[PDB]
Amino acid sequence: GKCRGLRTARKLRSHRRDQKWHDKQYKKAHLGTALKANPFGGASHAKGIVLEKVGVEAKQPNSAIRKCVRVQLIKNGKKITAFVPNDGCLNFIEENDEVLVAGFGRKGHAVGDIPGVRFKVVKVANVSLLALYKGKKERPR
């Protein structure tokens, strides 16, 4: 504190408000631009129509082609690059199958090598692709 008076109380209080808009983890919070951009719009999961399988290269030191997808969502009708996780699970998306996309760890901030990609898979039409890996459920014909 710096303006020590006994009846200042507002001088003091018009200054912190002013200030807190400089704060990032807040302004990112207190304007409508964060939710205008966002694909999910404000949400923890949101389903979508796949449309092609796609390999993304990884960034340096590392190298290895990373296996992703390109989804169109429902609500917005918007197009995201996503990312499969497990080994040999891409053989389980057929083109234009439906997936439950999720977030990926750190909120609007990617993980590791792969550029742009902020989203990933939990389900592939009413049963989780975790299970498919193990084999605890298998696919309908």
Partner: protein, 74 residues
């Protein structure tokens, strides 16, 4: 005093902001009904009023006594 048969009065006081253990000035104007039997009033004179039934849209006060400004003698 400009309105005919009436005046407006200033009423100052303070308000406890609790986070910061301090105060901030606050004011509330209100209109008052000065009735000509008080033949002499100026700006700044203290006035003592009391609640009563609505004399207009925005009047619910009537004047009871002048209490004069300091100095003022000449």
């Amino acid at each position: 005093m400009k309105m005919q048969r009436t005046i407006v009065i200033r009423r100052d006081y303070l308000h406890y902001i609790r986070k910061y253990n301090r105060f901030e000035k606050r004011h509330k104007n209100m209109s008052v009904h000065l009735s000509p039997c008080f033949r002499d009033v100026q700006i700044g004179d203290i006035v003592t009023v009391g609640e009563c039934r609505p004399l207009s849209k925005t009047v619910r006060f009537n004047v009871l006594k002048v209490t004069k400004a300091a100095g003022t003698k000449k």
